[PDB]
Design a protein around this ligand. Structure first.
Ligand SMILES: [Mg+2]
Ligand SMILES: [Mg+2]
Ligand SMILES: [Mg+2]
Ligand SMILES: [Mg+2]
Ligand SMILES: [Mg+2]
Ligand SMILES: [Mg+2]
Ligand SMILES: [Mg+2]
Ligand SMILES: [Mg+2]
Ligand SMILES: [Mg+2]
Ligand SMILES: [Mg+2]
Ligand SMILES: [Mg+2]
Ligand SMILES: [Mg+2]
Ligand SMILES: [Mg+2]
Ligand SMILES: [Mg+2]
Ligand SMILES: [Mg+2]
Ligand SMILES: [Mg+2]
Ligand SMILES: [Mg+2]
Ligand SMILES: [Mg+2]
Ligand SMILES: [Mg+2]
Ligand SMILES: [Mg+2]
Ligand SMILES: [Mg+2]
Ligand SMILES: [Mg+2]
Ligand SMILES: [Mg+2]
Ligand SMILES: [Mg+2]
Ligand SMILES: [Mg+2]
Ligand SMILES: [Mg+2]
Lengths: 376, 322, 109, 46, 236
RNA sequence: GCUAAACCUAGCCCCAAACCCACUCCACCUUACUACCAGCAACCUUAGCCAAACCAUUUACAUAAAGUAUAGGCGAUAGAAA
RNA sequence: GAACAGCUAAGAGCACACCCGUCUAUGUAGCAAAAUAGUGGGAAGAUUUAUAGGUAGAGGCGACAAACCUACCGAGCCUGGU
RNA sequence: UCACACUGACAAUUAACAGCCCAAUAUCUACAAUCAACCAACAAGUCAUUAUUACCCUCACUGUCAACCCAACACAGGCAUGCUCAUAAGGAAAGGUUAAAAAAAGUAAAAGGAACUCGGCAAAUCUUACCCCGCCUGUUUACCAAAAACAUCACCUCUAGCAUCACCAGUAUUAGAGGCACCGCCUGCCCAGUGACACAUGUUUAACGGCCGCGGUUAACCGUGCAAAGGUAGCAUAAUCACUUGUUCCUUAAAUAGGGACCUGUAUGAAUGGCUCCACGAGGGUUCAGCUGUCUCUUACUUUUAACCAGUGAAAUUGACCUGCCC
């Protein structure tokens, strides 16, 4: 089955005049005139090429001519890359362990609700003029309000002033598996930076013991399946800042996912996979900026967090990169899926049920505050 | 049908027209870590933040002016929390529309089937600030109720339709930052920013060099008036039921380098002729000239930085609500 | 639905009115999400000279003499500019790389 | 019902049906315009 | 007479292509088939009828995996997207094909028979005698065309030399080459003929206008014709 | 006597002779009366009313020869040339 | 793309806006070459509708009225054969 | 010059309201909307990019009026979107005098409340039983017939082994051409004739269509002739030629009206579909309690109308008329 349809494709041109097949006179064509003519023969114009370059009407060369056209097709990854399997694909591409439970230090750092409820109600109903808002409206608003609520505790911890939450921040990182080349790209949300690096959660004992278990395969599905295959990518890594910039080390990737429609969302499993991939890429970029580009085992492992999206459902991911040589030891990540703060909200009164959220739990806010603290 | 008032306008000498439509009183003047943080926030978007896509002149105010201002406001709110505890529990809305509706004066139909009938012309300000702060409690009064200040108000001896200000019909909205069912209804400071249209370079290219500060003054006046009117209507007050207490407000404007501050003091809400013949009160709106925050930036280093602007920003953000 | 009214920008609906218009000669182009860019090169720059010391007036006096009309043509111009042609015993063959070309109206008035 | 209103006004449909371009697109409109010109009408098309 | 066919998509895309209904109209504008038009909007999904087709730099067999089983509005039988390797492709779903199942796609004609599951596919030269099959192709590398509706399934009769006679669901014998590929089992969406419509609302939603009102006088073609089976048509 | 009729110049038709017009400025093939950007365009027996009381054959769109030879359900009608 | 209040609870019932027009009485140069007030069926669906394109007479369409196709369609109008 | 929106000159409307649109190479768009978070489905669905090449010249153009459109008009005719379902907006049924006759829109009734009329037809009291047709809902002659017809889901007949322009981007549970029309009993005979399928002297009837006559014993039954079969079940004077106001009971005191059982129905009848059946039809009839001036027997009142005063001001029609009755 050939997809195309002859009627939709470009119509085949008419047959050349029988006068050109005579070797070799001058076929009297209408080239002398500047308009279509029915009688007389049809000429064969040459391929015209514009002398000057017009940005409004500029044609790019083909793929066979480029400055860095490589033969090894590297598969890049971005926010739009919707995975297929789920978290297992991200774990295989990153080579890290999956722990179903947050660390002990973060949970212990915890040791109020009216403010959170008011902020939720505001962002969900009162933050706009019209009724029944949309995800694209209250998702970034919810994220910003939560960040502000978490940062308002600077009076208690004076060390929370040495950080900032930027917006348009990107990153890049390249690594090999067995043995193709991969690549990642920046995000499209927020990003919290810190002056000093985060502390090491897991010790070297766990890093050495992780050599026992292995990765989880998924035959016959390949780790690419959904990753974007794109040539001409430039392997030269890059970050979102330049040398000598305050607050260089990251802390928590506050990426969001707008989209008012369900099909335009990223799903929980695929969103967690994308978050893990982004955290691994940021950690690798930070390691390459601190150390060299050689493949070896790092001595001072870094830590990069990330929070889920969606005003209702929420996810947590605490990455911990300790080795740059993939191809040995591996990393470990702590996940907390399907946390979801408040179950449902009733913008209008149904006829029975008041105007407000239902099914709220404070553990989500406590975990958010603990993740925001960590270093303070 | 009501005149669609735009705070960010480009008309000439629109300050007098706005003062007449609002009945205000303008008055010139006012009633180490922070500097480093501001310089870092600047240099960030000015050089450090590697832009994937090449930014042009039209995509500058929307990619380097808004994020930098947002980061500056966030850093200020975070650093001023210990000294100002009222800012910790404050609600900050990033990019939220501000609407307000009111009536002013009368107007007889010139031609049509409605000729010979009094039609009170209406107005509406649909401001869209970049980010504002909200506090449950109200700000102090600064200026007492009912002030003399003998400076008169512009007259405007012509139809208001002459100035590029046309009429349009749509849903009348009176919105501050949230709905009436919210405790965080009051605020204090407000931030704005003009687009590539109202650029001082564009005004210098033409001959409207004297309108540079006038545009900022009119925008600040419109924003403050809309804010105060909407927040007073949220409390139940309106034309007939005049406000019993003043609704002071503050707003800061800029364009990318020059900064200036403006104050306000809402005194009355009855702008119609039915309650203006015996209304000796009037609103006030303080202001200052535009000063440059920094001369230029070389690669990754400020040149002539200014500390007075930062000091004024700190003084404006540290005002505690009584 | 008259057939005598000249079709202008005050007849068609919103789309027609927006697309059509008067013969005012556009300046620049339109790109992006409704972002018209003005090209300074296409803007008509009026070269106005200095009128200081201009002893001429837009009205002639009645005391001037009457003379016959002499249609200036190529032959008259060549006869007037014949000094170097006779002294020899200034012409361009191709004006493709010329700024103010003759046959192709590249200038304006 | 009242069938006296058989004409629905619309400039787009009028210009698309009795348009100069639609007329010249086929010899029908060409002959129509030629006849209208030979007759001497002031308005040839809509 | 502006009539452009929406079937304009060279690249095999997975997203539902916007289907522009026809209503029985041809390129001119006249109706040639009554009873088509006025239905609910639908979106066609590019189906990959050709079961066997390796990806880039590939040749040998390759396994597959089922992800989900969705419904197709353009046909009676449901579908189920299956991912194989570094790409995906919509294909027809078989009976008892749950999510996560493994589908084998090979083309090597083994010496003996191969016990095929209820989803995999192998050439007719490696199928036991008397086995229900569907999505049979006409020529080597042509594409599935026969037996593709809901519940339809043809049984394998016998093999003669390098050919194989397939008993189509219509009790008609068809000789197909042995090197051709064809799925096994019956198509999903069982008990479809028993699906009672209930009301004309669903009939109109499906996109079927009511029949004409002319009282056609039944002629000679209305009588029952007890015809025998037709001769076996081959493609060799 | 109120309402109402009277005025030839404009112009046209029939002929002789001769072969007539088509860029002050700008637009004119898309929504003609629009300054400014990447597609195939025509070469086809005319039919029919009518007449033969209807109609199916058939019927036209210089002078003389001569309406002669001829065709015509051998009829209404057609119809030349040397 | 838009439309469908409200009440009792499924191409459910009543009922706003809206689509259609079974009867009464006025008129047939009438307001109207198909109108006026009430009594009526539908009104979450096979429904109505704003925009544009396509199907035209030796035909198109038709939940068939052999009905409709710009006020007269058992088959339209205008040009020449009239 | 109903009365004074009719002539020549005077200038508004200023866009920010919506359009005027995206330079290419290739590659990613499967987990609906219905407060979308539980359930719950079917009609399977309305909004999103990637690396590179080249580009940092920027605020021009179209409408901004009104009592407005389409119907020969200043026409009781038609017109969608957001807001209020009587308002902050939107208008004057009465040019003056009288109550002629008649007509239309309404108000009240001593007594009956369908006895007037072919008919419970405008009127409000307001709801019940028995029959015909159709399954419903909807569509049907725009503009006299809006149904008992057209259609509808169920049933069944015939044709096709199949890719690029509708069918179809489909594959004998599919597509095309058709009779009737769910559910219950069900649908009995036939190719003599026409047509179709045949190439096997045949099959097809849920194709077009047809399913006996005579004498004897109201009748089992007997003999005879024709033919492929001689009307099967059912139902009944029906929506059913004439006989026919059929026989008979009820329904009115008064019944060619209606319902209940019978067929000499010689011309009813089983997908030309026959008989029952819980829902429903502005489809067609009867009827028990209540009624409304339809009547017995009508009147009084308000408005338009009606009569005089002022003006604009006509149609169809007219042979001229000095325009009667009886035989
Ligand atoms: Mg049918
Ligand atoms: Mg039928
Ligand atoms: Mg004749
Ligand atoms: Mg209903
Ligand atoms: Mg109803
Ligand atoms: Mg009929
Ligand atoms: Mg005649
Ligand atoms: Mg207007
Ligand atoms: Mg009319
Ligand atoms: Mg009046
Ligand atoms: Mg009167
Ligand atoms: Mg009475
Ligand atoms: Mg009676
Ligand atoms: Mg009587
Ligand atoms: Mg009645
Ligand atoms: Mg019916
Ligand atoms: Mg219809
Ligand atoms: Mg009718
Ligand atoms: Mg109708
Ligand atoms: Mg009717
Ligand atoms: Mg029927
Ligand atoms: Mg039968
Ligand atoms: Mg009878
Ligand atoms: Mg009776
Ligand atoms: Mg009905
Ligand atoms: Mg009079």
């Amino acid at each position: 089955y050939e997809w195309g349809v002859r009627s939709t494709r470009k119509s085949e041109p008419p047959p050349l005049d029988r006068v050109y097949e005579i070797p070799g006179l001058e076929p009297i064509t209408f080239a002398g005139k500047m308009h279509f003519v029915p009688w007389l023969a049809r000429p064969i114009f040459p391929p015209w090429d514009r002398g000057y370059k017009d940005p409004r009407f500029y044609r790019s060369p083909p793929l066979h001519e480029h400055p860095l056209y490589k033969d090894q097709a590297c598969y890049i990854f971005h926010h739009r890359c919707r995975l297929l399997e789920g978290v297992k694909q991200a774990l295989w591409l990153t080579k890290t362990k999956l722990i179903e439970g947050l660390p002990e230090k973060v949970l212990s750092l915890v040791d109020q609700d009216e403010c959170v409820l008011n902020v939720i109600s505001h962002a969900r109903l009162w933050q706009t003029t019209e009724e029944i808002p949309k995800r694209e409206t209250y998702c970034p608003v919810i994220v910003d309000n939560l960040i502000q609520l978490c940062k308002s505790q600077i009076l208690k911890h004076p060390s929370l002033a040495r950080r900032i939450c930027v917006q348009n921040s990107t990153f890049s990182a390249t690594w090999n598996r067995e043995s193709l080349l991969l690549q990642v790209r920046g995000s499209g949300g927020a990003r919290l930076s810190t002056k000093d690096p985060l502390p090491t959660i897991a010790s070297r004992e766990e890093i050495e013991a992780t050599k026992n278990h292995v990765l989880e395969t998924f035959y016959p599905i390949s780790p690419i399946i959904d990753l974007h295959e794109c040539n001409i990518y430039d392997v030269k890594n890059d970050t979102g800042f330049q040398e000598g910039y305050p607050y260089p080390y990251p802390h928590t990737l506050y990426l969001l996912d707008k989209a008012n429609l369900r099909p335009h969302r990223l799903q929980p499993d695929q969103l967690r996979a994308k978050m893990i991939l982004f955290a691994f890429g940021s950690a690798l970029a930070q390691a390459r900026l601190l150390y060299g580009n050689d493949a070896k085992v790092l001595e001072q492992p870094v830590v990069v967090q990330s929070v889920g999206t969606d005003g209702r459902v929420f996810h947590f991911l605490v990455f911990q990169l300790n080795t740059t040589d993939l191809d040995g030891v591996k990393n470990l990540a702590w996940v907390d899926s399907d946390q979801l703060l408040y179950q449902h909200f009733w913008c209008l009164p149904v006829i029975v049920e008041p105007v407000g959220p239902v099914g709220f739990k404070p553990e989500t806010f406590r975990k958010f505050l603990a993740l925001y603290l960590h270093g303070a | 049908m009501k005149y669609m008032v735009y705070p960010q306008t480009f008309a000439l000498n629109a300050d007098r027209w706005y003062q007449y439509f609002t009945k205000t009183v303008f008055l010139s003047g006012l009633p180490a870590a922070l500097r480093a943080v501001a310089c870092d926030c600047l240099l960030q978007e000015h050089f450090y933040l590697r832009r994937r896509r090449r930014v042009h002149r039209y995509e500058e105010s929307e990619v380097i002016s808004l994020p930098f201002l947002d980061q500056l406001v966030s850093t200020l709110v975070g650093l001023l929390s210990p000294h100002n505890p009222a800012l910790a529990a404050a609600a900050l809305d990033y990019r939220c529309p501000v609407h307000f509706y009111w009536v002013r004066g009368e107007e007889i139909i010139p031609r049509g089937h409605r000729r010979g009938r009094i039609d009170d012309l209406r107005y509406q300000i649909d401001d869209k600030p970049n980010n504002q702060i909200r506090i449950s409690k109200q700000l102090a009064e600064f200026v007492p109720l009912d002030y003399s200040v003998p400076i008169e108000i512009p007259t405007i001896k012509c139809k208001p339709d002459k100035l590029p200000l046309f009429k349009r019909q749509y849903e009348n909205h009176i919105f501050v930052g949230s709905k009436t069912a919210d405790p965080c209804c009051y605020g204090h400071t407000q931030f704005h920013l003009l687009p590539d249209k109202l650029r001082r370079e564009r005004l210098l290219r033409q001959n409207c060099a004297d309108q540079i500060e006038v545009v900022f003054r009119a925008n600040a006046i419109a924003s403050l008036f809309a804010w105060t009117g909407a927040q007073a209507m949220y409390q139940g007050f309106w034309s007939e039921a005049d406000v019993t207490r003043p609704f002071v407000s503050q707003a800061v404007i800029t364009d990318g380098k020059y900064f200036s501050f403006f104050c306000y003091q809402l005194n009355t809400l009855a702008l119609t002729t039915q309650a203006d013949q015996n209304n000796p009160r009037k609103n006030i709106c303080w202001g200052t000239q535009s000063k440059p925050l920094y001369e230029t930036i070389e690669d990754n280093d400020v040149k002539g930085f200014n500390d007075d602007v930062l000091l004024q920003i700190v003084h404006f953000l540290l005002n505690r609500p009584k | 639905a008259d057939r005598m009214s000249k079709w202008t920008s005050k007849r068609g609906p919103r789309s027609f009115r927006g697309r059509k218009g008067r013969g005012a000669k556009g300046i620049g182009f339109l790109t992006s999400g409704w972002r018209f860019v003005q090209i300074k090169e296409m803007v008509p720059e009026f070269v106005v000279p200095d009128l200081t010391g201009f002893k001429l007036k837009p009205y002639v006096s009645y005391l001037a003499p009457e003379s016959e009309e002499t249609p200036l043509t190529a032959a008259q111009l060549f006869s007037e500019a014949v000094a170097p042609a006779i002294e020899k015993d200034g012409f361009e063959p191709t004006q493709e790389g010329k700024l103010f070309q003759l046959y192709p109206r590249n200038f304006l008035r | 019902k009242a069938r006296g209103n058989e004409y629905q006004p619309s400039n787009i449909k009028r210009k698309n049906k009795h348009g100069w371009v639609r007329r010249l697109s086929t010899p029908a409109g060409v002959q129509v315009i030629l006849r209208r010109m030979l007759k001497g009408r002031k308005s040839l098309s809509h | 007479a502006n009539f452009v066919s929406w079937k304009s998509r060279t690249k095999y895309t997975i997203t539902p292509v916007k289907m522009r209904k026809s209503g029985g109209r041809d390129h001119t504008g006249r109706i040639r088939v009554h009873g088509i038009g006025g239905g609910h909007k639908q979106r066609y999904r590019m189906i990959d009828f050709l079961r066997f087709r390796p990806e880039e730099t590939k040749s040998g067999p390759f396994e597959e995996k089922v992800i989900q089983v969705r419904y197709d509005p353009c046909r009676s039988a449901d579908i189920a997207l299956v991912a194989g390797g570094s790409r995906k492709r919509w294909i027809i779903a078989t009976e008892n094909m749950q999510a996560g199942d493994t589908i084998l796609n090979s083309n090597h004609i083994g010496r003996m028979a191969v016990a095929a599951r209820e989803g995999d596919a192998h050439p007719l030269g490696a199928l036991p005698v008397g086995t229900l099959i569907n999505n049979v192709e006409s020529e080597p590398g042509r594409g599935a065309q026969y037996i593709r509706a809901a519940g339809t399934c043809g049984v394998l009769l016998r093999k003669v030399n390098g050919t194989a006679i397939i008993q189509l669901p219509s009790k008609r014998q068809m000789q197909v080459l042995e090197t051709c590929v064809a799925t096994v089992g019956r198509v999903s969406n069982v008990d479809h003929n028993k699906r009672v419509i209930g009301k004309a609302g669903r009939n109109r939603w499906l996109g079927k206008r009511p029949n004409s009102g002319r009282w056609h006088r039944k002629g000679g073609w209305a009588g029952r014709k007890i015809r025998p089976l037709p001769p076996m048509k081959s493609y060799v």
